[PDB]
Amino acid sequence: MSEENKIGTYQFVAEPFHVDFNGRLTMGVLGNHLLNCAGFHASDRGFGIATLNEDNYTWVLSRLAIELDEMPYQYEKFSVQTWVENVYRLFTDRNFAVIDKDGKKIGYARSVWAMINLNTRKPALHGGSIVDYICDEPCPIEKPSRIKVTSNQPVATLTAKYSDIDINGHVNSIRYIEHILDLFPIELYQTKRIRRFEMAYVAESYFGDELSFFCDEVSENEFHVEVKKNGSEVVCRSKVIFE
Amino acid sequence: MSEENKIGTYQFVAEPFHVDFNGRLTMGVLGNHLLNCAGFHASDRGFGIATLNEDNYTWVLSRLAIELDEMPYQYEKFSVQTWVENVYRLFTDRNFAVIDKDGKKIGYARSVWAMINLNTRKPALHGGSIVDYICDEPCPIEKPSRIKVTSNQPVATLTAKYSDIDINGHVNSIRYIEHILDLFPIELYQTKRIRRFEMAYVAESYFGDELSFFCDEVSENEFHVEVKKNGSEVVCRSKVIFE
Ligand SMILES: [Ca+2]
Ligand SMILES: [Ca+2]
Ligand SMILES: [Cl-]
Ligand SMILES: [Cl-]
Ligand SMILES: [Cl-]
Ligand SMILES: [Cl-]
Ligand SMILES: [Cl-]
Ligand SMILES: [Cl-]
């Protein structure tokens, strides 16, 4: 199997309820597409959640970094390519390219997934098919790493609601993205765009939990965000770079 | 052209970030699919927003009623059929059927759209193609009509945020659905399901507006909701029937 053959490619159109006030695809919706594509790619090749679950493992998303030159516009076609870059002992690195209507690469993403035993919730091989799909396609963006947040004064608070919760009873990955991006003043979105966005998923939140949001502005364009539940426990961290 | 030939049919899969804690497609996501399907159907046949806009008209959604026996489950295929039932002088009635993975009709929807002149914002014929697609397919649910809400004590308040706003700078149709459905206690969603849901879109809200929510519980299972902006102006009304 060729290197090109290990890549999954998926076609989309930017719908009106999935774009912002500038008509560009929202980060939350892009994240949704990336994670669904990861799932299509894994499931079609027999190394997705369903297969893992039969042997008492599952996949958990640990880190996501998205870097963009531009975002698709309302009603434009776009596509996502995804592939497995590495399968390490404790984590798998899955990468993405986003392709605009003209076939130009307009962004990239890197995701880091843990495999955990479902009985013990403990972390984490080759009887499977995943190793066969390790692919050398380039993804020329910096790997996501630990995010530091110094502030201990919350800037906003929000209770987890029915619309936030997925089938496992927790606040879903994408809903955290939406809430974080709602922290920023509209003048920022009017004058700049997000060029890099990172999520670190630390712990779970449930319906009724009070989420508090803390933010360090490290430069004019770089913000580090920490979300905590019920005061003290970090549930996720984020880095947002505007330009 | 046969009656069957005037129907558009669109295929979907219920994605994980589009279902609730019981694994069923959310109302907001279903609404999103219905409205997008309406758009696919109109645009493909030359009576959509794009065509209207060339002559200084547009379509505005006035009313939506959805009635369901069940909702698709996570990862199931489903489909939406849509067709034009009537083209009246001031409004067009567009209807929908929702079809489950087995081909069983599991719900219906009715939508009412106004055509308005874009210069004058005034309301509202045959040089177009729409009349050619009037279709007698059955949609055996009650038409939506005016919703009465008596309560003048708000039960909740929310500021319109970046994630709420569409390309025209207003709070989008689907975001109102999500916020309304977040008013109800989780015990209701644990023990009952929404069998009928109606929206009436009265006026627009913008970024930063304070939305207040008023609710009459007319019986154990029927709720009427009014959303107002900045205290006084009604922006939408809703009816939610659980069973
Ligand atoms: Ca989840
Ligand atoms: Ca709109
Ligand atoms: Cl989209
Ligand atoms: Cl699988
Ligand atoms: Cl981190
Ligand atoms: Cl869906
Ligand atoms: Cl059109
Ligand atoms: Cl009404």
UniProtKB/TrEMBL annotation, chains A, B:
Query: Is the keyword Aminoacyl-tRNA synthetase assigned to this protein?
Result: no
Instruction: Give start-end ranges for the coiled-coil region(s).
Output: none
**Hey, what's the signal peptide range on this chain?**
none
What GO molecular functions are on record for this protein?
acyl carrier activity; fatty acyl-[ACP] hydrolase activity; metal ion binding
- Summarize where Ca(2+) binds, as residue positions: D166, H170
Q: Which SUPFAM superfamilies match?
A: Thioesterase/thiol ester dehydrase-isomerase
Q: Which UniProt keywords apply?
A: Calcium, Fatty acid biosynthesis, Fatty acid metabolism, Hydrolase, Lipid biosynthesis, Lipid metabolism, Metal-binding, Transit peptide
Identify the residues that the record assigns to the Acyl-ACP thioesterase-like C-terminal domain, covering every copy. Answer: 154-224
The record places domain Acyl-ACP thioesterase N-terminal hotdog at 18-124
Report what the protein is called.
Acyl-ACP thioesterase
Q: Which family does it belong to?
A: Belongs to the acyl-ACP thioesterase family.
Which organism encodes this protein?
Bacteroides thetaiotaomicron (strain ATCC 29148 / DSM 2079 / JCM 5827 / CCUG 10774 / NCTC 10582 / VPI-5482 / E50)
